Amino acid sequence: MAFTLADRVTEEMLADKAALVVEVVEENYHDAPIVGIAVVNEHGRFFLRPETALADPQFVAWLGDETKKKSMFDSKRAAVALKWKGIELCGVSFDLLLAAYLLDPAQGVDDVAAAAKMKQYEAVRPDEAVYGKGAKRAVPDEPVLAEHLVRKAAAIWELERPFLDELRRNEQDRLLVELEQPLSSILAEMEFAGVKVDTKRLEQMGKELAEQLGTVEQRIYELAGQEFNINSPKQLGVILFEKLQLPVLKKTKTGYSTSADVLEKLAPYHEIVENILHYRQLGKLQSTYIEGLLKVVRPATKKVHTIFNQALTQTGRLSSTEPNLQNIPIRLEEGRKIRQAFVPSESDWLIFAADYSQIELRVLAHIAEDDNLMEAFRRDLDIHTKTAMDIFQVSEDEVTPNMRRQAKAVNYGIVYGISDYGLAQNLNISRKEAAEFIERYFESFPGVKRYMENIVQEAKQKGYVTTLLHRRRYLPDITSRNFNVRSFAERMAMNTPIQGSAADIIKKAMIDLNARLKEERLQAHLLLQVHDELILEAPKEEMERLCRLVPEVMEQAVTLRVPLKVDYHYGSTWYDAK
DNA sequence: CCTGACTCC
DNA sequence: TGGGAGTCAGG
Ligand SMILES: Nc1ccn([C@@H]2O[C@H](COP(=O)(O)OP(=O)(O)OP(=O)(O)O)[C@@H](O)[C@H]2O)c(=O)n1
Numbered sequence: 001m002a003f004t005l006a007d008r009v010t011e012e013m014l015a016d017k018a019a020l021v022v023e024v025v026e027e028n029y030h031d032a033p034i035v036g037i038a039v040v041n042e043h044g045r046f047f048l049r050p051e052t053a054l055a056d057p058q059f060v061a062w063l064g065d066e067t068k069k070k071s072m073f074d075s076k077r078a079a080v081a082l083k084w085k086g087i088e089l090c091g092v093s094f095d096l097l098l099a100a101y102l103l104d105p106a107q108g109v110d111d112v113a114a115a116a117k118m119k120q121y122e123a124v125r126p127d128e129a130v131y132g133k134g135a136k137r138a139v140p141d142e143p144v145l146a147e148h149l150v151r152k153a154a155a156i157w158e159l160e161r162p163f164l165d166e167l168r169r170n171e172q173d174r175l176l177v178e179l180e181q182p183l184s185s186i187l188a189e190m191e192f193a194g195v196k197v198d199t200k201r202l203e204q205m206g207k208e209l210a211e212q213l214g215t216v217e218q219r220i221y222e223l224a225g226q227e228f229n230i231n232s233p234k235q236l237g238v239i240l241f242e243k244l245q246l247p248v249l250k251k252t253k254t255g256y257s258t259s260a261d262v263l264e265k266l267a268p269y270h271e272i273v274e275n276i277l278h279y280r281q282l283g284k285l286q287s288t289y290i291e292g293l294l295k296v297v298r299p300a301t302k303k304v305h306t307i308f309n310q311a312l313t314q315t316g317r318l319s320s321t322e323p324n325l326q327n328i329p330i331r332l333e334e335g336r337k338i339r340q341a342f343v344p345s346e347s348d349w350l351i352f353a354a355d356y357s358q359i360e361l362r363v364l365a366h367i368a369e370d371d372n373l374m375e376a377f378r379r380d381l382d383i384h385t386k387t388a389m390d391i392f393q394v395s396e397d398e399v400t401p402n403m404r405r406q407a408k409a410v411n412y413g414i415v416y417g418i419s420d421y422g423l424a425q426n427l428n429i430s431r432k433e434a435a436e437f438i439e440r441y442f443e444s445f446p447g448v449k450r451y452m453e454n455i456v457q458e459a460k461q462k463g464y465v466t467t468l469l470h471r472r473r474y475l476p477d478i479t480s481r482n483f484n485v486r487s488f489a490e491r492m493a494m495n496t497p498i499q500g501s502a503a504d505i506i507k508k509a510m511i512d513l514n515a516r517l518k519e520e521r522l523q524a525h526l527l528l529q530v531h532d533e534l535i536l537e538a539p540k541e542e543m544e545r546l547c548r549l550v551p552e553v554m555e556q557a558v559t560l561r562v563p564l565k566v567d568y569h570y571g572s573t574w575y576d577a578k
Numbered sequence: 579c580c581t582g583a584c585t586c587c
Numbered sequence: 588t589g590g591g592a593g594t595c596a597g598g
């Protein structure tokens with residue numbers, strides 16, 4: 001494969017259609033080096049050194065010109081890496097990573113070679129082959145690097161049409177071009193903006209937490225009558241089941257279980273298990289949300305810059321890494337206070353948080369076309385209280401807080417394919433009763449039962465299931481004669497259209513929201529998405545408008561057979577936006 | 579490196 | 588024997 005190793009940018013490299021590689025080898029691309037550039041177009045194939053291309057006003061103009069279309073793989077990586085250099089990338093019309101992800105998330109495509117494999121294209125090497133793995137990872141000699149980048153660009157160039165053609169067959173071309181690609185740009189902005197952190201506050205919490213860990217730790221040793229590593233499920237298992245001779249409720253492949261659910265069930269036998277649960281909760285707060293967070297905060301700006309992986313989950317959700325900002329504590333007050341350290345990036349700005357209320361159950365209502373479930377949402381009746389009246393068979397006045405919590409476990413459990421065994425274990429109730437709850441639920445919501453039957457049948461017949469905006473998940477195990485394997489696939493068939501349609505909806509909402517913010521020239525911008533919620537920051541003056549704009553855009557992103565409902569709060573910190 | 583903790587939706 | 592994720596310490 002012939003290419004030019006160019007010393008300067010020329011006009012023919014700046015055609016209005018090109019495959020473009022802007023190579024960043026560090027896995028975390030924030031403020032990461034760009035090691036090489038390749039361009040393939042109608043005129044030839046070119047390798048450029050970054051020092052050259054990125055200092056060249058004409059190349060930089062071309063990068064930022066939206067009418068000059070680029071085909072890429074992982075354009076968000078390149079866009080953010082370029083942002084850290086103050087260079088804008090526009091005109092990305094095809095992203096091979098996102099295309100491959102839509103065609104089959106299970107393939108785990110994460111380099112051009114793996115995408116190319118999908119079309120039996122082999123004139124390109126895997127990145128790991130060129131760079132090496134782990135401690136061996138290195139950028140090779142220029143001629144080797146240059147050929148690799150050029151070959152990746154040529155693969156993207158040749159693969160665009162084949163991938164677009166299959167997406168069109170799957171009814172997924174608009175999902176790529178109107179949803180995932182625009183979202184990629186929005187996520188790039190979110191990651192690059194980052195979220196500001198009050199490190200003084202975290203360091204203080206950390207100091208206090210260290211004190212408390214020491215106290216809980218020593219009390220646990222007193223209760224155990226021995227010192228041991230409480231963070232070692234192995235050592236803990238000996239203490240609990242050999243020394244204290246507590247009952248063994250569950251084993252894993254390696255030994256005794258010490259899961260939270262097991263320890264809770266052991267509470268009637270020894271008080272030490274409650275202390276241990278507390279200690280493990282505190283230790284995670286310290287290790288992860290204090291120490292781990294502080295490790296990744298950029299010290300001069302005090303911002304953290306997560307990476308949203310847009311091409312990983314099997315259902316169409318995002319994930320968040322380094323750090324994960326989608327699992328910041330909220331359920332326990334001690335941990336929830338971590339959110340006090342997430343603050344606005346400017347003076348006199350505020351945090352604004354908006355979340356869909358029960359979007360999975362509303363989606364289930366839509367997809368199952370269950371009259372009773374649809375009517376509950378159409379009239380905004382409390383769905384957990386409704387299910388309680390049904391499973392316990394009482395009037396609304398007789399529903400206690402605990403009954404509602406159990407009904408809630410039923411409501412979400414059904415969505416995730418729970419068995420009577422799993423429900424009984426989660427609620428710690430008789431399995432006979434758990435089975436009755438499930439039987440009563442399906443008697444009350446017969447449309448949901450038909451849905452579960454139908455979607456498993458569809459998966460068996462077609463080999464995959466689909467979401468509202470035509471995302472797909474293949475389920476080859478659905479016809480397995482093996483009960484365990486088939487059962488897991490049946491649960492995925494039931495759940496994926498629900499979880500995945502919910503992901504589709506919030507993604508479309510982010511695009512519609514961005515458009516409106518820019519339309520109204522507001523300074524407000526997105527910081528985070530947490531599956532069914534959106535977190536923004538804005539100058540305090542803009543709260544009144546956002547209180548109207550954000551929930552309307554979210555509720556109207558798609559139109560279902562039941563309303564969507566969005567709650568919203570704002571405050572001086574993420575904690576206070578409650 | 580894998581497992582089993584913890585955290586979120 | 589409930590769906591989808593990431594990080595951490597221990598081994
Ligand atoms: N028994 C439960 C309860 C909750 N969840 C999970 O935790 C998420 C958040 O649940 P939650 O906030 O409690 O849902 P709500 O319906 O909004 O609860 P509530 O009306 O009481 O505020 C759910 O989407 C689900 O993924 C679960 O798996 N099992």
Ligand SMILES: OC[C@H]1O[C@@](CO)(O[C@H]2O[C@H](CO)[C@@H](O)[C@H](O)[C@H]2O)[C@@H](O)[C@@H]1O
Nearest residue numbers: 027028074077110111307309310311321
């Ligand atoms: O840039 C995100 C993009 O890159 C991939 C590899 O193609 O994931 C890499 O980067 C992630 C973000 O740092 C890492 O978490 C991951 O380990 C690394 O392979 C894709 O998975 C992805 O969407």
